[PDB]
Design an enzyme around this catalytic site. Sequence first.
Site, short mmCIF file in Angstrom:
data_model
loop_
_atom_site.label_atom_id
_atom_site.label_comp_id
_atom_site.label_asym_id
_atom_site.label_seq_id
_atom_site.Cartn_x
_atom_site.Cartn_y
_atom_site.Cartn_z
N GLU A 20 -9.91 -7.29 14.97
CA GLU A 20 -10.14 -5.86 15.19
C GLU A 20 -11.12 -5.56 16.32
OE1 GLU A 20 -10.98 -3.81 11.59
OE2 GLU A 20 -9.36 -4.79 10.45
N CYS A 28 -12.95 -3.98 7.67
CA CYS A 28 -12.43 -4.17 6.32
C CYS A 28 -11.12 -4.92 6.40
CB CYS A 28 -12.21 -2.78 5.70
SG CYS A 28 -13.08 -2.27 4.24
N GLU A 77 -5.54 2.92 -2.15
CA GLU A 77 -6.14 1.59 -2.05
C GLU A 77 -6.72 1.30 -3.44
OE1 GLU A 77 -6.29 -1.07 1.50
OE2 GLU A 77 -6.05 -1.14 -0.63
N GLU A 125 -8.60 -1.97 -5.08
CA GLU A 125 -9.14 -3.21 -4.56
C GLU A 125 -10.39 -3.67 -5.30
OE1 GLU A 125 -9.65 -2.18 -0.35
OE2 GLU A 125 -7.59 -2.96 0.05
N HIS A 169 0.84 -1.20 0.00
CA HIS A 169 0.00 0.00 0.00
C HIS A 169 0.87 1.25 0.00
CE1 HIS A 169 -2.85 -3.06 1.76
NE2 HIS A 169 -3.69 -2.47 0.93
N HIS A 185 -8.02 -7.86 4.36
CA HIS A 185 -7.37 -8.49 3.21
C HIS A 185 -7.31 -10.00 3.38
CE1 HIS A 185 -5.71 -4.31 3.12
NE2 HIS A 185 -5.85 -4.47 1.81
N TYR A 244 -12.90 -0.65 -6.34
CA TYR A 244 -12.70 0.79 -6.19
C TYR A 244 -11.23 1.12 -6.07
CZ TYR A 244 -11.17 0.68 -1.28
OH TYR A 244 -10.47 0.46 -0.12
N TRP A 268 -15.03 4.54 0.75
CA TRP A 268 -15.60 3.24 0.41
C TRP A 268 -16.92 3.00 1.17
CZ3 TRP A 268 -11.03 3.53 3.00
CH2 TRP A 268 -11.04 3.13 4.33
N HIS A 314 -5.64 -5.50 -5.88
CA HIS A 314 -5.58 -6.66 -5.02
C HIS A 314 -6.93 -6.91 -4.34
CE1 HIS A 314 -4.51 -3.30 -2.31
NE2 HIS A 314 -5.08 -4.03 -1.35
MG LIG Z 1 -9.14 -3.55 8.80
MN LIG Z 2 -5.57 -2.93 0.41
#
Ligand SMILES: [Mg+2]
Ligand SMILES: [Mn+2]
Lengths: 176, 180
Positions: free
Chosen positions: B84, B64, B111, B113, B22, B66, B101, B158, B29
Amino acid sequence: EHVILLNAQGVPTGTLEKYAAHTADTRLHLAFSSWLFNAKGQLLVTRRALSKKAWPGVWTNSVCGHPQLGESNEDAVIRRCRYELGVEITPPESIYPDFRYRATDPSGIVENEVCPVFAARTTSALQINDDEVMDYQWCDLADVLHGIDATPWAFSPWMVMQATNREARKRLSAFT
Amino acid sequence: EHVILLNAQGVPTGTLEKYAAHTADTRLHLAFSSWLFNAKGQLLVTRRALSKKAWPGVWTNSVCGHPQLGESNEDAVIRRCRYELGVEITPPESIYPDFRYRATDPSGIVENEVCPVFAARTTSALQINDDEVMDYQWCDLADVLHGIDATPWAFSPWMVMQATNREARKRLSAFTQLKL
Ligand SMILES: [Mg+2]
Ligand SMILES: [Mn+2]
Ligand SMILES: [Mg+2]
Ligand SMILES: [Mn+2]
């Protein structure tokens, strides 16, 4: 720079260096808040820089600060408009003179202030100080109040308390 | 910890370490985004920690992240909810699978993604992880949508793009029902 310590009545009793003053245990002191509008009647909303000790990264009204010993509230507004936003303004007008509040930010830093509120019009372009402001938006005041009424948590607690004072809201509504 | 790199079409080609991935020049990704509701039907909104590389200190939807190699998107949702927020969830429902986006953050971090969106219910109390989340609120979805419409600039881009997709919004609305 310092802050001015106030007793229970609002009498100045001494000062503290500004950074050292704001802790998990902040003591009562003097401050101001201001709302800036352009010639078109748009409201300037700012996002505090991530380096601010208190409420870093939070969306809030235009400019906030700490009058120094001997300085008028209005001169302090003019000073921080220049310092944070590089902007010239019309003489600040009072919109909530008795505001006072205490709040705690997400990391535990407290603000504890007697904080009269003002409004003014910008008479020059902004020139941003990125140690103070990380983002900003010129917006319609009606939309900002709609956002504060629906999702107050997205804004600083003092912006919300000010904007939800019936009289202050009427007076702000005259600058548009 | 890494990201799964995708080519010009949505097809994986490899991985890249996550911090490094990033930058100002982020390659496309795989990611996911999730909207979490408690039993009462309130939505969990969260504020990204000031230490996040991208959009630090920004108000957004619940979680959010990955997916990692070998992980389904749904397992990634479950894992990041635990990491989290410390929270258990019901099986995540796909509510916007073709969301994709690209956006630059206030520092210039990008970002980029392919980011399927999910919704789920929480089934345990929170144990917020302050390395990831600096504030949160349980809210009525109607109010959040009003705020997004009045002052969209105050939230992550987002969250706003997902919330204003008609189909995804109808699924969000379905999760506001009270469920014992
Ligand atoms: Mg997160
Ligand atoms: Mn990312
Ligand atoms: Mg200030
Ligand atoms: Mn202060």
